[PDB]
Structure formats: C-alpha cells, structure tokens
Design a binder for this molecule. Sequence first.
Ligand SMILES: O=c1ccn([C@@H]2O[C@H](COP(=O)(O)OP(=O)(O)O)[C@@H](O)[C@H]2O)c(=O)[nH]1
Ligand SMILES: [Mn+2]
Length: 351
Amino acid sequence: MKIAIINMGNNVINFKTVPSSETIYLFKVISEMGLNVDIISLKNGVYTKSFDEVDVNDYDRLIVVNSSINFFGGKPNLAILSAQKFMAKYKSKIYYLFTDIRLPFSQSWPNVKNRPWAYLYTEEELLIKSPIKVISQGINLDIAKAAHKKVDNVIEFEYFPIEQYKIHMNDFQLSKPTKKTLDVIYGGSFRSGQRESKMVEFLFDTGLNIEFFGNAREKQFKNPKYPWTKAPVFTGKIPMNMVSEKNSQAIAALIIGDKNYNDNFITLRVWETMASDAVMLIDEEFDTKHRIINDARFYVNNRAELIDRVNELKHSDVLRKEMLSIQHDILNKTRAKKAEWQDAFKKAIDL
Ligand SMILES: O=c1ccn([C@@H]2O[C@H](COP(=O)(O)OP(=O)(O)O)[C@@H](O)[C@H]2O)c(=O)[nH]1
Ligand SMILES: [Mn+2]
C-alpha cells in the first residue's frame, strides 16, 4: 500500500503558507496512522518528492487537497498545471479533500484553452477523466453536491471531519496560560469578501482591543452594505504552526464562517481556538444546535452580545478560567476518539 497526496494548486515546501502547511499536516497525520505516504509537489524537498521524479501509477491511492485553479495575471501557474497533469495520468479513483466551500474540484482545461499560452498544453494532458470521490468536511453534504454540479466524474460524496487533524497530531498539546494583551482576536484571510458582513459585525466598532491577523488587510473592507468607523488592528500573517500561540494572546477568540459553513462545517479554527488559552466565542448562526459545545455561554448572536460577553470575561478571571476548563475538557473528549477517527479516514479512502 502506497499513498500519494498532492495540493491541486499550491506549491508545498514549508509552513510559511497556509496551503503548504495544511498539506504537510495531512501528510503527517496520515503517516502517523500507519501508512506509507509521499507528498508530490514541484520539487524535491524536506517533505516532498517531485512530480517529474515519480510515476503516479506507483501509488495505490491518490489524495488531492482542494485548491483554486484560477490563473491570476498572465502566466502559467505550474502548481496548478503540474498537479492536474499528474491527476490526468492516474488510472484509479481520486480522493478530493473538500475543506473549503469555495474550492470545489474542477477542470483547468476550460480556462487554459483560452489563454495566450494554451499552445503549451493539450487537452489530453490536462483533462482529468478518473472517477472522483469528494470527501467533504460538511456533514450535510448538500453544499458539496451543489458545488460539484458542473462535474460528471464525481460519482461519490462522503463526510469526514478532516480538519480534526489539528488535535490528533502526535505532537499536539493544549495551550498554557498566557499573558493577555488583547480582548478579542481572529486570524484568517479576506476570503474574497465572502465573510465581510460577519467580520465587520464582530470585529469592527466594538470599543474593545481587537486584532485581526492573517492575509486580510483593512483596505479590503469597503463594501457599502457593511460600513464601519473603527477597524481592528491588522498585524499580518504568521505560520500555521504558530496560530494557537497567537490566539492565546487574547481573552477571547472568534469563530465565524461563510454562510454555507453554518450547521455543516466544523472548521480547523474551531480546534485551533478551542485548544488555545483564549475563550472560544462562536457566532450563534454558525452552530445553531450547539454541536461544538453544549454551553450557551460560548455563543454570541451579534456585536452587542460579543461586547457584553467579553466584558464579563474581563471582569471575572474565575469565569474566564471556568470556561477555558470546560472547552479544554470538551476538546479532550474528541481526542479520546482518535482511533475511531483514524479508522473512519481509512474507510473514506476505501482502505
Ligand atoms: O496568519 C495566519 C492566519 C490564519 N492562518 C490559518 O488560516 C486558517 C483560516 O483560513 P480562512 O481564512 O480560509 O478561514 P476559514 O474559512 O478556514 O475559517 C486558520 O484556521 C489558520 O490555520 C494561518 O496559518 N496564519
Ligand atoms: Mn478553512
């Protein structure tokens, strides 16, 4: 049994970029559950083999991490092209890890054919015909199915909480008590404005000391429908393996998601936040049935409620520590099901 994992549209090297980091974490968690796996990327490296040094058919399973296949600017993105060429040569079923609703599987050919550099690729080299099984992080599968309507080879849809890998890593540990320097914190990208309303609601004009880390920038928030006066402090990106430490600098950390994540996706940030020294505060709309934690104190409906909840936490260190103790206990209950999680993953990739 030999497994190959690749990122469909981003180079994989180290932990400097999110797509590279997530691919390496997945490689590591799969290796830790008893499996011979290789990451195949553009070049040979600490964690990877090169597309041109291996034969895709030497592998029995091909796992693909979702990614955008948009060609920005006027140049051939080799990370996208080489990955799809690799996929096109594979004979067996391809397992597509769907962790972001904006990144469903799709063919790059339709786009490539109309580029000025189209002469560099043939339809045969890029058109992927192998059957595809979408492994969705969404438990309802409704979004995954709708997102993959324009694809015919996708013959299967199965749910699996992929991003729980954060807590199942062999080197994982809960964050320790940290000196507080912020009231509220949130880390992430602008996500092409797909979450602007929620970001403005909970992180702007709060009167609190809030930090927004990640690729997002203040100048990106300009939608007239979601006005604001005072923005949080944007500090820039940091490595994915430093996120829990960053979250721990605040009294509370926010959990929000795209509309379609609601009552469906339990994202990586849920675990990165729950494991941190910051109290996890969740937008009620994101998890209306309170599947993450059965304690309403961890949920807020709007800006006003967030402010009040944070004020309560700043006023009582006892309450803050009580809530942290509860969320850490809940996280431990899921960690206790590691073996079941691993077996479920193996079942998902037909092992
Ligand atoms: O500076 C940063 C900010 C965020 N992240 C990662 O980016 C994820 C958030 O991704 P996104 O902004 O797409 O939000 P999601 O839709 O996953 O909530 C976090 O969970 C972190 O793992 C990171 O590595 N560095
Ligand atoms: Mn995500």
